[PDB]
Amino acid sequence: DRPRFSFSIAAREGKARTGTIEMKRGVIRTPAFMPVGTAATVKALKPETVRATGADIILGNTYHLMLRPGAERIAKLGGLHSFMGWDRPILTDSGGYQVMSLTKQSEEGVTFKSSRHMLSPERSIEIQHLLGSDIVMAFDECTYPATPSRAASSMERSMRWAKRSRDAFDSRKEQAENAALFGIQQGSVFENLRQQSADALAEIGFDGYAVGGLAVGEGQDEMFRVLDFSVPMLPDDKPHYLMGVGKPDDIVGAVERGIDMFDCVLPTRSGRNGQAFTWDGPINIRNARFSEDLKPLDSECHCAVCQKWSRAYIHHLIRAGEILGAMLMTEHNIAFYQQLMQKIRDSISEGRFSQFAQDFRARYFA
Amino acid sequence: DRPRFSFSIAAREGKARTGTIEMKRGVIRTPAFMPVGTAATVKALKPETVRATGADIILGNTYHLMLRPGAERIAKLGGLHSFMGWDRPILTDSGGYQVMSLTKQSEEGVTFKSSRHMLSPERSIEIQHLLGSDIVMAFDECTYPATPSRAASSMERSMRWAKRSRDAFDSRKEQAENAALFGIQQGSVFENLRQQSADALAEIGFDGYAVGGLAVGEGQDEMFRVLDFSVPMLPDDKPHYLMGVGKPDDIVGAVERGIDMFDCVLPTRSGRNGQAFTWDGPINIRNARFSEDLKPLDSECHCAVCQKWSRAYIHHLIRAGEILGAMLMTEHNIAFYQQLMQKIRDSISEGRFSQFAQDFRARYFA
Ligand SMILES: CNc1nc2cc3c(cc2[nH]1)N=C(N)NC3
Ligand SMILES: CNc1nc2cc3c(cc2[nH]1)N=C(N)NC3
Ligand SMILES: [Zn+2]
Ligand SMILES: [Zn+2]
């Protein structure tokens, strides 16, 4: 058999780590990038295509699926894995962030209109149980910028909700035996609050630790500044998950600061919009300069799109609003992200990650 | 090597025929259904997926590609096959119909606004040469309903244009050696005009013969009535192509009347709109009755979609406007159409096509 959750670090370089998380439904190579599958689909990609790009795990959302099609309904249809045809690990967010960004707070939970609903640690854990997710996120309260006093109250409530999330998860035998639970560090940009948050979470004990409250419009310099002191407070021997990050350069700098796990909509969303990621930086394939360009999107990429189709053809499809345009751009961008994570993992294992990061930034921002 | 164009009839039943067209880029099993690839894509499908459904040949359009991206541009990029990544036969329409349905006529040609352009037999043949299409359609003038006198003038002009199409095609050595040319019968619903048209075309001589002027809002009874006398006027030993047809029942009845080749947008367009074809008739997958239906779209279909995904999941994707919804619905519907053509071909070969048509209509309209 396979283990419920086992994280092993095979190599380090500075604060960077590379290794594996073994779970019942598969192995997750870290640092890992999770394609986002908001509405039980990674947009414009079959699951086999997601897997073909190298993805080991995808992200689903408690918030969208509890509304459409409904958590009980998904459970009746056999669970999210069966429903969408992805048989590998799935991490589900708790709904705390999407409840905010997409409405009455209290100590019990949140009530909101999407058309009237309530979420709580207990209800959030139960929804993720019904979905059958492999990595369950604790339910948290999100707020930026915010005063030291506001961020402290909001961090404190999240810590009380983390303990309730822990207890609700542990009360469900099948969930506790087959899934893993991650806590979410809060505290905004304030070091002392981040430390109190880390301590709270470590005293409860989780399988992994997310850094929340970033990637909310703070700029990379500030984000790195917070990661600089925040990540070392977390348990070293557990995975570190930076929620909602991000651009390729953000990912590289976050790995240099000890992050193991990432998710964001940028490769999928900006793909459909005409932005393709390349080692030479992003390009807008709608630009007229690509109309007769026979080169593939990226001259080194190994993905199926770059083996078969020219920039000129993809230029034409996107300008025409053709669905195949969105498919090919999305496949290429997800492949790019996975190739980036692969190169990150190999360079750490080989002890040349610093040189990789230097070489990557020189070429990408040339 | 392979032949330029060789049609062989392997079996007959009544007026129905089954066989093969061998061309340089591949073999076309007949009766054949051509998925429509308007803007150099079969909407929402990779070419490998089109081929996986059973398609031997696809249809492209002189009218759309001469505007976007341009015929000379496609030729500079290596031809339509290379551009879109389909290496098998492509039939291109001449632009006559789309010029009408999507503006000054004369004996020389048509001038029109899409933004100002002109088409003629000579220009149409040259565009299809630049595209590299394998089956070239003659350029014709289209008009319904229309008086006997109007249809006769319009049929007469089309016949003069067919001879100019023939001469332009024959003047281009590489085209005449590697591609095939089809004439288009006109004459509206009038038997005498259809006969004069057939005679005109047969005196010129073509590799195949299309029936034009149908599938323009005439109803199936009238269409069958026209096919009843029209198809027998065409050369028996050449393929018979019914342009723009059609619904599954239309196809079956047209094969019973001697048609070998078909194209229409219905499987692709109505796929994206939520209509799925099944042996039990079409279904609208958006309907609430499918929200918890774990069966595949069709319980006999062998396509990849019906092997992996439930009606409930596809219901959810289409209701959410997800691209994967359009992909799966389109793949299934194109697979359905190809499975229909396969069952037609096998039943004719086995001499039980009449029984197939009976059994098909009983179940499909139950
Ligand atoms: C796109 N930015 C982003 N920042 C996040 C931060 C969090 C999150 C998701 C995020 N996405 N999920 C939570 N449950 N809480 C913290
Ligand atoms: C959808 N109906 C339809 N009827 C057609 C009839 C013709 C055609 C395309 C059609 N499509 N192309 C031509 N060049 N002429 C006759
Ligand atoms: Zn690529
Ligand atoms: Zn199917």
3-state secondary structure B290-326: HCCCCCCCCCCCCCHHHHHCCHHHHHHHHHCCCHHHH
Ion ligand 4: residues, CB within 5 A, are: B 301, 303, 305-306, 332
A·B CB contacts under 8 A: 94
Which residue has the least CA distance to atom 11 on ligand 1?
A244
DSSP string computed for B97-155:
HHHHH--EE-SS-EEEE--EEEE-HHHHHHHHHHHT-SEEEPP--------HHHHHHHH
Ligand 2 centroid–CA B184 distance in Å is 9
Length of chain A: 366
Strands (E) in A246-319, as ranges, are 261-263, 275-276, 283-284
Q: Rounded to the nearest 5°, which phi and psi values hold at B111?
A: -115, 145
Rounded Cα distance between B151 and A256, Å, is 76
| Among protein residues, the one whose CA lies closest to atom 13 of ligand 2 | B97
Q: What are phi and psi of A33, to 5 degrees?
A: -115, 125
Question: What residues contact residue B232 under an 8 Å CB cut-off, 6+ apart?
Answer: B15, B258
Query: Considering only CA atoms, which of A254, A271, A211 is closest in space to residue A344?
Result: A254
The residue nearest atom 6 of ligand 1, judged by CA position, is A212
Query: Which residue type is seen at B89?
Result: P
C-alpha of residue B303 to centroid of ligand 4, in Å: 4
Of A251, A280, A255, whose CA–CA distance to A362 is shortest? A280
A69: nearest CB among B41, B69, B291 = B291
Chain B: give the shortest CA distance to residue A283, in Å: 20
Residues 6 or more apart in contact with residue A220 via CB below 8 angstroms: A249, A250, A253
Cα separation, A176 vs B226, in Å, equals 70
CB-CB: which of A68, A294, A317 is closest to B41? A317
Closest CA to A94 of A175, A165, A176, A5: A165
Atom of ligand 1 nearest to the CA of A212: 16
Min Cα distance B322 → chain A (Å) is 7
In 10 A of CB A294, how many CB atoms?
A: 13
Tell whether B114 is within 8 A of chain A (Cβ). Answer: no
Task: Name the burial class of residue A288, with classes exposed (0-12), middle (13-18) and buried (19+) by CB atoms within 10 angstroms of its CB.
Answer: exposed
Q: B283-284 and B275-276: which strand pairing? A: antiparallel
B163 touches chain A (CB under 8 A): no
The answer to whether the CB of A250 is under 6 A from ligand 1 is no
Beta-carbon contacts of A75 under 8 Å, excluding residues fewer than 6 positions away, are: A130, A131, A132
Mutate to test the interface with B, among A46, A86, A87 (most CBs of B within 10 A): A46
Helices B323-349 and B248-255 meet at what angle, rounded to 10? Answer: 20
CB contact under 8 Å between B324 and A291, yes or no, is: no
Residue in chain B closest to A87 (alpha carbons) equals B308
Contact (Cβ atoms closer than 8 angstroms) between residue B349 and residue B18 = yes
Domains with residue ranges and CATH for chain A: 1-366 (3.20.20.105)
Q: Tell me: is residue A228 an annotated ligand-binding position.
A: no
Q: Minimal CA–CA distance to B186: which of B163, B232, B153, B218? A: B153
Q: Using CA atoms, how far apart are residues A263 and A93, in angstroms rounded to an integer?
A: 11
DSSP A61: E
Question: Which of A61, A64, A93 maximizes ligand 1 atoms within 8 Å of its Cβ, making it the mutation to test the pocket?
Answer: A93
Question: Residues of B numbered 46-65 whose beta carbons fall under 8 angstroms of chain A's beta carbons: which are they?
Answer: 46
B50 three-class SS: helix
Tell me the C-alpha distance between B224 and B213, whole Å: 13
Residue B103 alpha carbon to ligand 2 centre in Å: 18
Residues B131, B75: Cα–Cα separation, whole Å: 6
Phi-psi region of A44 (alpha: psi -120 to 50; beta: other; left: phi over 0): left
Nearest to B57 by CA among B31, B39, B77, B78: B31
* Catalytic positions of A: 93, 263
- Ligand nearest the Cα of residue A124 is 1
CA distance linking residue B123 with residue B142, whole number of Å: 17
Residue B4, token pair as written in the block = 């330029």
Residue with tokens 């392997």: B10
The enclosing H or E element of A99 equals helix A96-101
CA atoms of B318 and B302, how far apart (whole Å): 21
- Alpha helices, DSSP H only, in chain B? 47-52, 62-67, 71-76, 80-84, 96-101, 121-131, 148-170, 173-178, 191-204, 220-230, 248-255, 266-272, 304-308, 311-319, 323-349, 353-364
CB of A140 closer than 6 angstroms to any ligand 1 atom? yes
Q: How far is A76 from chain B (nearest CA, A)?
A: 8
Ligand with smallest separation from the Cα of A93: 1
Breaks in chain A (C to N > 2.5 A) come right after: 102, 114, 143
Cα B242 to Cα B248: distance, rounded to the nearest angstrom: 13
Give whole-number Cα distances, B344 to A101, A115, B34, B262, in Å.
Answer: 55, 50, 15, 13
Please tell me the distance from the alpha carbon of residue B198 to that of residue B184, in angstroms, as a whole number. Answer: 9
What is the C-alpha to C-alpha distance for residues B31 and B342, in angstroms, rounded to an integer? 8
State how far the Cα of B232 lies from the Cα of B277, in Å rounded to an integer. Answer: 31
B175 marked as binding residue: no
Measured CA to CA in angstroms, residue A60 lies from A37, A57, A136 at distances of 5, 10, 10
The full length of chain B comes to 366
Q: Which of B36, B38, B43, B46 to mutate to test the interface with A (most CBs of A within 10 A)?
A: B46
| Strand (E) or helix (H) holding B280 | none
CA of B335 to the centre of ligand 2 (A): 23
Residues of B noted as catalytic: 93, 263
Question: Is B96 annotated in some ligand binding site?
Answer: yes
Nearest ligand 1 atom to alpha carbon A139: 14
For B200-218, letters b (16+ CB in 10 Å) and e give bbbebebbbbbbbbbbbeb
Residue A83 contacts B, CB cutoff 8 Å: yes
Q: Which residues of B touch A68 (CB under 8 A)?
A: 316, 319-320
Please indicate if the annotation marks B94 as binding a ligand: yes
Residue in B with minimal Cα distance to A49: B324
**Ligand 3: distance of its center to the CA of B178 in Å?**
34
Residue whose C-alpha is closest to residue A135's, from A42, A235, A227, A26: A26
Assess A87–B contact: CB distance below 8 Å, yes or no: no
Q: Which residue minimizes the CA distance to atom 12 of ligand 2?
A: B97
Q: How large is the angle between the packed helices A191-204 and A220-230, nearest 10 degrees?
A: 50
Q: Which residues from A are below 8 Å from B68, CB to CB? A: 316, 319-320
Name the residue with the closest Cα to ligand 2, atom 3. B244
| Residues of chain B positioned with their CB less than 8 A from the CB of A76 | 292
| B181 alpha carbon – ligand 2 mean position (Å) | 16
8 Å CB contact between A262 and A244: no
Secondary structure element (H or E) that encloses residue A264, with its range: none
Tell me how far apart the alpha carbons of residues B52 and A48 are, in angstroms, rounded to a whole number: 16
Ligand 1 neighbourhood includes A184 CB (under 6 angstroms): yes
Nearest in space to B35 (alpha carbons), one of B17, B64, B67, B60 = B60
B332 is in an annotated binding site: yes
